[PDB]
Write a protein that binds this DNA or RNA. Sequence first.
RNA 1: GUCAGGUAGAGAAUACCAAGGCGCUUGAGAGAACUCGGGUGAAGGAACUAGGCAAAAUGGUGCCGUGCACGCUGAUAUGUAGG
RNA 2: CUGGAGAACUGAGGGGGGCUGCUCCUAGUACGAGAGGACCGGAGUGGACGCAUCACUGGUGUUCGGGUUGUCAUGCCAAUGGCACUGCCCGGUAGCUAAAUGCGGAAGAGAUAAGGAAACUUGCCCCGAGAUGAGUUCUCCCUGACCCUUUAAGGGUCCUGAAGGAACGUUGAAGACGACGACGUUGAUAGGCCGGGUGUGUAAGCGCAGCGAUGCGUUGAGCUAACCGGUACUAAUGAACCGUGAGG
Lengths: 106, 144, 112
Amino acid sequence: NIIKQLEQEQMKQDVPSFRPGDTVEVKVWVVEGSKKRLQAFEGVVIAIRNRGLHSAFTVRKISNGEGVERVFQTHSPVVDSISVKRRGAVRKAKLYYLREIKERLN
Amino acid sequence: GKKVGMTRIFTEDGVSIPVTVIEVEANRVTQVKDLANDGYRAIQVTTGAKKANRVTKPEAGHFAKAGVEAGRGLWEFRLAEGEEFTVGQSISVELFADVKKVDVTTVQSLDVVRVDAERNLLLVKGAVPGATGSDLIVKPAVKA
Amino acid sequence: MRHRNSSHRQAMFRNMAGSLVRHEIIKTTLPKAKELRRVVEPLITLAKTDSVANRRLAFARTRDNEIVAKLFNELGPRFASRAGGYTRILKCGFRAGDNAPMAYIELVDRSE
RNA sequence: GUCAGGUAGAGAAUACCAAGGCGCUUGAGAGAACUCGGGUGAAGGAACUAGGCAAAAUGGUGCCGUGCACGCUGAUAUGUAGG
RNA sequence: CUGGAGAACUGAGGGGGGCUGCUCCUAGUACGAGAGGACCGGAGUGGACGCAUCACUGGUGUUCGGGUUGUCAUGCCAAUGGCACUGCCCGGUAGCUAAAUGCGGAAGAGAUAAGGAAACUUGCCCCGAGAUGAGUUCUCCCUGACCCUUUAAGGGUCCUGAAGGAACGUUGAAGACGACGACGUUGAUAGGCCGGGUGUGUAAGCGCAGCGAUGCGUUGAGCUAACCGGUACUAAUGAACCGUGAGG
């Protein structure tokens, strides 16, 4: 209860609802010397770890030649906004098999 | 104090600091040692509470002598000839506000992140020995 | 560092749990009786509420139609008002064969 | 040396059953200070050694590539070439 | 300056330790006839070794959950369970492990040698009274009778069982030699019954269409061990044993 009370105010309630296998765009702050820039990352969510303040999700992006995986901390200040583009119709909690999708229309 | 789990805090700039969160009730003095009797300067302090039926009266009489309520365990720290304390005095966590490095028992030179008195809570950057619910002793860093 | 094989252990508790329900009391070694509780009461708690799914799951455990019939009919209502602690263990000396601590484990019933 | 059923399978291998034959002539609790033997466990996959030995990987065939098909077919045909 | 217990301190002595390299400010400075260009101190950034070590980053997890091949039992089909290495493959919420994260070596003081240095003796961290000036400081409990009597730490009989601790039972993440952390009925430590979160990602049953193999509604639902937040109507209960009664 001490831990929970400490993290409730640190957590943010503006977290959008997304599911594994969804196409997600996430904006992340970037520091270059003395300037703050907003970087846009496009990818598909392949894993979500729910632990409250420590909740995180993995996004895989197919870059020019090879894929890139990126683990974001949902409640970190670095991430500003998260938007969902497609509602992937998968039936697995962790989509690790994409290393080596339908659309839900709901 | 008592160790109560572990968590992390996110700063405005973005970096996240893993913090050990220690709950520290008001520490109330029970005995004061001096050169005349004990040959050294130290204060004996207690914390927490103990069941009346379980606390043996040899300690209860010792606690009652100082007007102190029976706590769990006893610890004492040596003085630096620059401070004075009186029997029965209550010590809270605000004393750590002015110090940035603390020693947790020993893991030494740990940054202090936040201190508050309304909730009797102290925060330390890093990990400290022992599992949750264990007893810890926090003192200012000696290696200045 | 802890801060029978699995199959044999699971089968034994399944059999012993069924025998306990059928007879309301059984004589067994004290360690077995203590470990049997963590398998026995959960069955009675499920039997407190009756449903098609619960009946099927209760059958999947103990794999016996007689026990399921025994449950959900009188063990359910007889323990509806009781919140846990449906079992009682009485130590009864040691087994003469190998000096094993023996104890009767019996459901809190049979007050006739 | 002979007699050795059903399903799956190329087979006399192996797994799962009926009939028949049995629990092998010390047991009940507690967990590993790693003496022994398997499966799994990040990889610059040789940073070990005289020797990548023993393991692991591997094996097949609804086959046109010197990669593809693979467990089920409303229907073609409520069983197609045919003994 | 030897009565019988439960704690907090003083720390002699002994053991593990005195990491390394680079850049920036000091500074186009000192030395040298120019160029080249400091050393030390301070600050910051890597790697190696050791203690602590999980809120966050990975892997593993023979109990729960999802999917499935060959065969069999439960008088049946559907729906399950057991066996074939955990049947094989893909994950995860507690406990155990590091790549990551975090801390420690440096500075100060008395005594150096050579001609006032990273070595010795310290400061920092862990342990410490079977270290005999013989239990410091603080606290709790105790003021009970007759004979023999060579009349003195002698023996015998009767009465008493405190403080505190141990055993048995519910727990043992201190790593199985276990007297150890707490709690044991003014009682939530463990084994259950609920609620919440995470993981699994569309179960059983019913209904419409195709009258098949799937998918949708029912339903982000069902289930979920060692853990989080509550509740004693179950069980740790009530008698002993051990240790004494004013201290040369």
